Amino acid sequence: LAYLGVSVVLFVIAR
Amino acid sequence: QKIGGIFIVLAAGLVLSVLVAV
Secondary structure, eight states, rough: HHHHHHTTTTTSOOO | OOGGGSSTTTHHHHHHHHOOOO
């Protein structure tokens, strides 16, 4: 779960 | 327990990994 929570930065980096 | 002695690192990790700047 921690690895998947790290792995969001590409989709959450839409800024 | 040290079972719950490794979870002090959990709090910072995702807001370090996503939270940064612009």
